[PDB]
């Protein structure tokens, strides 16, 4: 969950 | 498998 | 450690 958490911020981001 | 995949659409769309 | 290092990389990219 920790880096899915951490891909999720991105997609907030780039997505 | 399915966090990879979410990583190379990232990727994809930075490059 | 590999989807991590991808993951650093796209946190340094945008940042
Ligand atoms: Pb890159």
Redo the contacts between chains.
């Keep these: 969950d920790e ?2 958490r ?2 999720r911020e ?2 907030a ?3």
């Design positions: 880096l899915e951490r891909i991105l997609e981001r780039i997505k």
